[PDB]
Write a protein that binds this ligand. Structure first.
Ligand SMILES: Nc1ncnc2c1ncn2[C@@H]1O[C@H](COP(=O)(O)OP(=O)(O)O)[C@@H](O)[C@H]1O
Ligand SMILES: Nc1ncnc2c1ncn2[C@@H]1O[C@H](COP(=O)(O)OP(=O)(O)O)[C@@H](O)[C@H]1O
Ligand SMILES: [Mg+2]
Ligand SMILES: [Mg+2]
Lengths: 475, 475
């Protein structure tokens, strides 16, 4: 094992780790979920490359993730046999962190703020993590090694490893002996893996005379979630699975699992978040559905199936109309895309309509988080303009608040005589529109006024020129 | 009085009449409404022609219908200075009709059923009707006289009418003296004239010392009803106005009044008849919106603003983006037209939908009447397949009738944890269909199956294979 080198974590990473830790000891069972989520992602990566060249499965073609513990060495080990990593990859992915989290770090009993990051979840429970990975296809003499007390630096070196995949060993802190108990760990892997197609085995040791008797019984049922029938899939499974594909700690507000067989044979499973991603307002930001084909994972962040004013959506698409060779290029100049695209655009509005009716408190959350993104909507897609206006919420004079708790239908159902219109006011701050003008001309008569004060509102009212009869007019 | 000639009525007019007099004696006050209504139509015609050739108003350009009565002679006279008629016009329009069906089988509690008023309603109240008229642009020696007792024949002749227009005189049947009363008559006009733009003036007679001064004073507000604000229009006015522009005694199921103003500047006012016209099915029937350009009437029965799937929609449409020259032709290749046929097509649907929600009984009534034509829809309007389907209804398996009670939105409210479904079934009448194959098992599960029996159902199904969320299918 020669080639030892030591690096420094991005100045902001130490700021994440040490922070995230205290912030999550409330939910520490997490790491075990995040590693499996990753073992799963590592398996799809393999099956993908394997399409192109089916020899990467050199030997075993049955992917799986194994858990086990040295009650004596105080360790827990999770080892899958997926793509595995390359040394240069090890340094890119593990060594760093592709995303962001600095402009907010210096701000703000389960203290969370805004989710940490998958893999490092491990340090909430381990004071030393070790990885030994051997990339798919490559040589067993180029296995890598990554060690880190997570204090501030980490180490890499080259090693050998016959088997392919990734082996992660966590050296538990003191007062974590829970994860060295069969029922406890078993319980957790049980709880965190139903949404996962990858079989999840767990080490079983039995003393049947002679030597020792090792096994690996799977706790996992194993079944691509979007494959089974809604009728049998529970909400627990629907929620964690979202977390899985969304790479987010929080839960979702709702979901639309749908199968379709006709002109567009696909099978979507979109999700509606609950918190807006911290990096949602800067150009380079991941958005798009996890694209599948013939149940074969292909690409991620494929934005070409969702119109811009719906970036915030999340989920997969198990199409069958797309060629198994779909590229990032092909997709953009595809008709089956443009079709699927619009066919799904509606499914999100339908999912939203259904939401706003069943749980308003959940919908209000939705509105707050993704308010200004849905608004730039009827400004370049009048196709569905009505459904998109109904989904819209505003701040009215009926409420003695800045609370965007009013639907346009709420506004109509409370009109009077001397009607014909929905009057608004376009200011800057809620204050600059609730008292700073001349709505009083109307207040003296008893007519409702929509107090709009969000930067985009003015530009939006140039495309929204009426809502079911009653036209819109400024004051 | 030269040219004197008597003529006989067509065979069903002598029938239509006698039948009409008893069927409508409940509403005798009705004739007064129909003469002013016609007087108004004359004022329109004139202004229309007046465009191309302003000589027509020859000097007297203040249009108005004047009502008066005489107690000792016992007559009620109505006279307008509208377009007036010529001898050939008279004979064509007054001596005949264009509204058949063939019955009168009910002879040998009011009996209305389904039939057309118009001019003849005058006989309900009058045992003799006289008409002196002289069309615009015609030497006064070209006046025309028409007189009939509604008994079977009529008399035409030439007279000299220096005045332009039409003077109608009724000799009231005995026991009709309640129409010689200034207050009863003055109340009827008022009730039937405030939804009419043509000033309606009533006569006045006084005793100014040995002399007799004849006043005339408007009783009317005289304003195009689609020009006023939705708020100042009584539901009564909307329904009278309906009878006006639709030439139908029956009230409408609903209406939609809208003043669009932006790219497309127009004013629409549509309605949905309480019952399909007797002569509907017969491609040689007149459907259409009455068309006005710059508050000037131009033409009736213009088909170009409503798709064949919504031909039954009565109503008018004032416009501003069209030229005071539109003709049955230009509309064919005009873009402003098409854009309205769309903007409006998508306004009928909203009215239809607000109908299936404010009074579900009228919608049913509507469905029984025109459903069959609203079905031929999704086979041509793909852009509105959403609202269309949300409208149309069928007979189920949960229903004890051929009666089309069930809507597609309540088959989902009454759909269970069984699956993704909206099963339908074809055949002929409700008969050879409710008792046929593979409907048994779907039953053993407690599932419903929309039973189709309409000659078109299967064809129409083809184009509507979606309906929000749940996907369609046969059995
Ligand atoms: N078991 C594994 N096999 C291969 N790559 C892995 C594995 N675990 C983690 N990785 C790599 O680490 C990267 C970052 O991990 P993570 O912190 O969980 O964020 P994310 O996985 O969502 O990208 C992944 O993109 C992947 O390249
Ligand atoms: N006062 C009038 N001035 C001119 N033409 C008239 C007048 N009254 C009736 N007419 C003509 O005679 C026809 C007969 O009247 P009516 O029974 O009401 O049929 P309609 O419903 O089309 O008016 C009218 O359509 C019109 O052509
Ligand atoms: Mg991850
Ligand atoms: Mg008439």
């Amino acid at each position: 094992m020669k080639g030892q080198e030591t690096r420094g974590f991005q100045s902001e990473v130490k700021q994440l780790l040490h922070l995230m830790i205290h912030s999550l000891y409330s939910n520490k069972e997490i790491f075990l979920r995040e590693l499996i989520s990753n073992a799963s992602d590592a398996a799809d990566k393999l099956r993908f490359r394997a399409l192109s060249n089916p020899d990467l499965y050199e030997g075993d073609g049955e992917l799986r993730v194994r858990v086990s513990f040295d009650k004596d060495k105080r360790t827990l080990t999770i080892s899958d046999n997926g793509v595995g990593m390359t040394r240069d990859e090890v340094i890119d992915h593990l060594g760093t962190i592709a995303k962001s989290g600095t402009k907010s770090f210096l701000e703000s009993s389960q203290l969370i703020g805004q989710f940490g990051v998958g893999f490092y979840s491990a340090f909430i429970v381990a004071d030393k993590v070790t990885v030994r990975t051997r990339a798919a296809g490559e040589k067993p003499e180029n296995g890598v090694f990554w060690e880190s007390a997570g204090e501030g630096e980490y180490t890499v070196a080259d090693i050998t490893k016959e088997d392919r995949g990734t082996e992660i060993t966590l050296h538990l802190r003191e007062g974590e002996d829970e994860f060295l108990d069969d029922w406890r760990v078993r319980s957790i892997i049980s709880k965190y893996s139903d949404h996962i197609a990858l079989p999840v085995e767990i080490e079983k040791r039995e003393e049947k005379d002679g030597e020792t008797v090792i096994s690996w019984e799977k706790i996992n049922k194993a079944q691509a979630l979007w494959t089974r029938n809604k009728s049998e899939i529970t909400d627990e499974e629907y929620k964690e699975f979202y977390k899985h594909i969304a790479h987010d700690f929080n839960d979702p507000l709702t979901w639309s699992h749908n199968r379709v067989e006709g002109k567009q044979e696909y099978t979507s499973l979109l999700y509606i978040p609950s918190q807006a991603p911290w990096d949602m307002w800067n150009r380079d930001h991941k958005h798009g559905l996890k694209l599948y084909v013939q149940r074969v994972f292909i690409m991620d962040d494929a934005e070409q199936f969702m119109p811009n004013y719906l970036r915030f959506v999340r989920g997969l698409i198990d199409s069958s109309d797309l060629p198994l060779n779909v590229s990032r290029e092909i997709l953009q100049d595809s008709t089956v895309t443009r079709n699927l695209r619009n066919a799904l655009t509606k499914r999100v509005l339908q999912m939203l309509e259904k939401l706003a009716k069943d749980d308003a408190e959940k919908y209000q959350t939705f509105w707050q988080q993704f308010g200004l993104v849905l608004k730039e909507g009827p400004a370049e897609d009048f196709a569905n303009q009505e459904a998109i206006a109904k989904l819209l919420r505003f701040a009215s004079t009926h409420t003695d608040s800045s609370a965007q708790t009013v639907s346009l239908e709420d506004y109509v159902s409370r009109m009077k005589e001397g009607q014909e219109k929905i009057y608004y006011i376009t200011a800057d701050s809620y204050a600059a529109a609730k008292s700073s003008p001349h709505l009083e001309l109307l207040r003296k008569k008893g007519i409702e006024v929509l107090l709009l004060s969000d930067r985009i509102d003015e530009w939006m009212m140039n495309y929204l020129t009426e809502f079911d009869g009653k036209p819109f007019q400024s004051v």
